[PDB]
Amino acid sequence: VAGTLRLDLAAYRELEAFAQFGSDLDKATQAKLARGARTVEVLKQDLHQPIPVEKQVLIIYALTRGFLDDIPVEDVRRFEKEFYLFLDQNGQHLLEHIRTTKDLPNEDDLNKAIEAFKKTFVVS
Amino acid sequence: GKHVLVVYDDLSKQAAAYRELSLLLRRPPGREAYPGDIFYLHSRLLERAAKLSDAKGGGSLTALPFVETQAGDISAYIPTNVISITDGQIFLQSDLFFSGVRPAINAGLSVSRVGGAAQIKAMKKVAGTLRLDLAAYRELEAFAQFGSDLDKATQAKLARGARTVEVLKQDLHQPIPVEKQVLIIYALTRGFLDDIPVEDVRRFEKEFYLFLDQNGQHLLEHIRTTKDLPNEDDLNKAIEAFKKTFVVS
Amino acid sequence: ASLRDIKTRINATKKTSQITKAMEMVSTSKLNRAEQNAKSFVPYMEKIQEVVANVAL
Amino acid sequence: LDAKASEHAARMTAMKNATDNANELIRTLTLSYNRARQAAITQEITEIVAGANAL
Amino acid sequence: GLTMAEYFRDEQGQDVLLFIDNIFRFTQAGSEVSALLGRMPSAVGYQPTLATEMGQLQERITSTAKGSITSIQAIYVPADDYTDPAPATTFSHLDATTNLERKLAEMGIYPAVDPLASTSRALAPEIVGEEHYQVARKVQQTLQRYKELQDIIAILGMDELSDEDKLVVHRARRIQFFLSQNFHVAEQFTGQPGSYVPVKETVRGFKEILEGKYDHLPEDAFRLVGRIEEVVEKAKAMGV
Amino acid sequence: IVIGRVGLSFFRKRNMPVILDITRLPDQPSFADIKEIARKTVGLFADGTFDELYMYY
Numbered sequence A: 001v002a003g004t005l006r007l008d009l010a011a012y013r014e015l016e017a018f019a020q021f022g023s024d025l026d027k028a029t030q031a032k033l034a035r036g037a038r039t040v041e042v043l044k045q046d047l048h049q050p051i052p053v054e055k056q057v058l059i060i061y062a063l064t065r066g067f068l069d070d071i072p073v074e075d076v077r078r079f080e081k082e083f084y085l086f087l088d089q090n091g092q093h094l095l096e097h098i099r100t101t102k103d104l105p106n107e108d109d110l111n112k113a114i115e116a117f118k119k120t121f122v123v124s
Numbered sequence B: 001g002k003h004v005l006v007v008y009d010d011l012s013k014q015a016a017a018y019r020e021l022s023l024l025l026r027r028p029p030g031r032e033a034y035p036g037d038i039f040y041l042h043s044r045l046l047e048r049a050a051k052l053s054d055a056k057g058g059g060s061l062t063a064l065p066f067v068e069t070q071a072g073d074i075s076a077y078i079p080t081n082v083i084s085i086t087d088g089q090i091f092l093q094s095d096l097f098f099s100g101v102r103p104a105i106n107a108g109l110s111v112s113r114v115g116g117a118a119q120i121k122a123m124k125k126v127a128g129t130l131r132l133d134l135a136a137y138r139e140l141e142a143f144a145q146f147g148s149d150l151d152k153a154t155q156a157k158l159a160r161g162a163r164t165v166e167v168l169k170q171d172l173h174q175p176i177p178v179e180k181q182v183l184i185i186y187a188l189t190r191g192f193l194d195d196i197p198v199e200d201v202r203r204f205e206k207e208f209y210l211f212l213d214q215n216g217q218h219l220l221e222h223i224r225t226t227k228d229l230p231n232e233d234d235l236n237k238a239i240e241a242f243k244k245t246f247v248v249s
Numbered sequence C: 001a002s003l004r005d006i007k008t009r010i011n012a013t014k015k016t017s018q019i020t021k022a023m024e025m026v027s028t029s030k031l032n033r034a035e036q037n038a039k040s041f042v043p044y045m046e047k048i049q050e051v052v053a054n055v056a057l
Numbered sequence D: 001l002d003a004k005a006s007e008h009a010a011r012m013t014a015m016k017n018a019t020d021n022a023n024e025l026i027r028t029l030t031l032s033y034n035r036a037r038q039a040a041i042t043q044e045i046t047e048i049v050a051g052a053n054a055l
Numbered sequence E: 001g002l003t004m005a006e007y008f009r010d011e012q013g014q015d016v017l018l019f020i021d022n023i024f025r026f027t028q029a030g031s032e033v034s035a036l037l038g039r040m041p042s043a044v045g046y047q048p049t050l051a052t053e054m055g056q057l058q059e060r061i062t063s064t065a066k067g068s069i070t071s072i073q074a075i076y077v078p079a080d081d082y083t084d085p086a087p088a089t090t091f092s093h094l095d096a097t098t099n100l101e102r103k104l105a106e107m108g109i110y111p112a113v114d115p116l117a118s119t120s121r122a123l124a125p126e127i128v129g130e131e132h133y134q135v136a137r138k139v140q141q142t143l144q145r146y147k148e149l150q151d152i153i154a155i156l157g158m159d160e161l162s163d164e165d166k167l168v169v170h171r172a173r174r175i176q177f178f179l180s181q182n183f184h185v186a187e188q189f190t191g192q193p194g195s196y197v198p199v200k201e202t203v204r205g206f207k208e209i210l211e212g213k214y215d216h217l218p219e220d221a222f223r224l225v226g227r228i229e230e231v232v233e234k235a236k237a238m239g240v
Numbered sequence F: 001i002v003i004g005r006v007g008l009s010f011f012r013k014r015n016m017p018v019i020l021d022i023t024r025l026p027d028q029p030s031f032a033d034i035k036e037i038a039r040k041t042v043g044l045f046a047d048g049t050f051d052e053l054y055m056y057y
Helices: A002-013 A029-043 A053-064 A073-090 A092-101 A107-120 B011-024 B038-046 B077-083 B094-098 B121-143 B152-168 B178-189 B198-214 B217-226 B232-245 C003-040 C042-055 D002-053 E002-010 E024-037 E050-058 E085-093 E102-107 E130-156 E165-178 E199-211 E228-237 F005-013 F035-046
Strands: B003-008 B060-065 E015-020 E068-073
Touching (some): A029 A053, A029 A073, A053 A073, A053 A092, A073 A107, B038 B060, B038 E024, B121 B152, B178 B217, B178 B232, B198 B217, B198 B232, C003 C042, C003 D002, E024 E050, E024 E085, E050 E085, E130 E165, E130 E199, E165 E199, E199 E228
Parallel strands (some): B003 B060, E015 E068
């Protein structure tokens, strides 16, 4: 997932001048800016709050696969925190699979978990 | 118990001579080959100007050191050292000099740390409005030359600011008495110069000085005797009387 | 000049360059769309020109 | 319609000319900056060595 | 002076206010005597023992179990160059830092404290409170965002901007002017007596400004006011 | 008759009379954008107020 994250951040670091210009609809650059803003919001972290790698992988997967697109930028950190709280409650099998095999879990099961959490999440 | 004024015409030349003699005495060099105590030299020189207490006789000594810069680089070693010592500085700029502003005091950068305490009542009263009127005009155009649009109040800021620049101009070897200075600055800051054109402000000032010399002697006497402003109404009427007979062109 | 002054000038010029590049990239697309609008206008102008040239005489 | 097309084309051309001028100015200023940096380093090291060997 | 203060710190267990004037002069004199003492020069003409002397002086000004010494020190920055060795070395010893800017000074804003460069390790949610932390961070973010818009405005004018950054700049000007204050010792300079503002009212006023309760007030009414009622009083006195 | 703010400001800086004007327009105007101004311009010739019309662009 790191390669896709790097590409998404590199696309957004340029075109920063285009924030004000072309505020109207555009087919490509609007999506790049929207993805980059959420990537920047995801990469933020609080002081003395280390995160396990099995949760880092899952949140980066959720960001890169497009599950954060329909969520406002202001709600991204709350979404991440509530997703972490949801993970150790329900996706214990996914977390254990990641911890034991050092590999991504099954794609369909991960997708089902993500939409199941998104149904519960409340957009503000 | 007397009062003295002392002018040091180039402390940069003094520092260069000190560096020369120090290098000839084989003392190790510092920054730009200057000796280590180059700051101490000027601090020792300039700390001897003071205003003595009443117990010491009440005498005073005033110092006006000069420093010459290279292409306006006030960040150099000697200019920085001297700036850090004195109680203020006056910046003269070639850009202002060639644009017609003579003398070329840069009002945005010139500062006096003894401000107000070194002025009479009338000067303190009028310079407060003068400073704001100049600062607003300068900061209006500092951001941009024109801007997207200008208000009628902004046009007024730009007209009276230009008139202040016209008033502050002066020629060589013609000092003006403090009472005439306060009277002309009053006439400006109270809005009597709005109708007078920018190209006629200076001639207005000269003929105004002549008018006060001929007729407004009592106001000058009151100012020079009480150090405070005369009656508002009498001064307003005198300014209006002069403006009645002044000829626009 | 001094190093700090030159560095500040470089930074300001770089910001100006980026702003102008963005404006140019926007204007190119706007011109491309205006050309299509002008193309779309053509047939109505043609028909009205023909009908006027006929009737007005 | 011609007026709008001309306006957009004129904006495009003026902006690209401005960008080219800015790039040329950046190049020249960078050259000046490098020269000043080299001169500063040389002067500093020369002064340090002179002070060191003056002892 | 430090020796006089340490007696009150240790032998009596008092709380001592140690006001030290320009630290830079101590280092400057140390460098002045260095060449005659026979020592080799350093990078910018300073003495080789700059950091050692600085630390030996500064480490004695500390709070212990017997008592606490709090020290406020003015530090000269030569020619506004913050990379100078003496100010650069002084940073390691400080808990809170206040930076003064000539740009703010010339614009007419006093105390001219830089709102972004100034730092303090006491600005934490568990130290000052979550509301205070939120207000401070929001003010800093608003000012930083406004600083960015100035580059665009200087070329394209204000009209080209949208209607949310319009509000951003319109409130950032108010915040920047409200950060000013009239001092008691500035009365000799301005003729206006100073004011004392408690931190609770400071936070309340800044939060209200951020929420837009006084958005209709004129911009110039916020200069040198103090409390949040005083800007309303000034606006009343000068029209709105 | 002026279209756009720049020409309006240029003429108002001098002392030339302006009868009608429109300032803010879409970058891609549609058929009904300047219908009123065009109709009024035609009407000013219709009621004999004008002798002839010249357009510059």
